[PDB]
């Protein structure tokens, strides 16, 4: 998968769990 969507997915994981 492309780098742009992947980093936004990791950002989504941080904010969903805090």
């Amino acid at each position, epitope marked *: 998968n*492309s*780098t*742009g969507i992947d*980093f*936004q997915d*990791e*950002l*989504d*994981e*941080f*904010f969903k769990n*805090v």
Partner: antibody
Amino acid sequence: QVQLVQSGAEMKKPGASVKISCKASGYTFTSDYMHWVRQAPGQGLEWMGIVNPSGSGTRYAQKFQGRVTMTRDTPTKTFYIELTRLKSDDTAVYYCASGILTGLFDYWGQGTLVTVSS
Amino acid sequence: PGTLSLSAGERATLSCRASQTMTKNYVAWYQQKPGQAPRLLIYGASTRATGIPDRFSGSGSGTDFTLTISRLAPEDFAVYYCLQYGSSPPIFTFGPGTKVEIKR
């Protein structure tokens, strides 16, 4: 086309607070992380914080923790920064930026000069 | 951050001094011209941003990351910034700018 339009230049005395707006257009405003970046005249860029698309999640740079506040209002498609306890060091051009493509800074506002001085 | 002087068509290689291997490969490069907003050129160490010519390129691993301009076009002369970032916790840290100027 994505377009970010910030409010106009501001003049503030030391110790006062400032609130810049950033109005988005051309897209849903519901997908993108947003950032605030500032640049003192003749100096480098400095990241300040990030806001998730819902606006319920933020993460400021540690230098501005406790004095900055970022908010978002999807129905008005407006992005806000609120800096307080202003010092002369805070004189800078402030940029809003959208991370719709990479999560970084893909689209920029025109910027807003904030001059803190007595 | 020493200024670079070179003629058009020359090669330049900018380096970024990472801390703790940045993270994964999270380094990006921004270009800014006077009176203008910064423009992203490279992110993820090596993948180009939209509308950025192939003459720009990025590479590196560990603490050593690099932006190469294989040949400078007249429009490539500007200040260039390294951006180190991460996701958990989110953080975004610009490096000092490096001006690239026309040798004469």
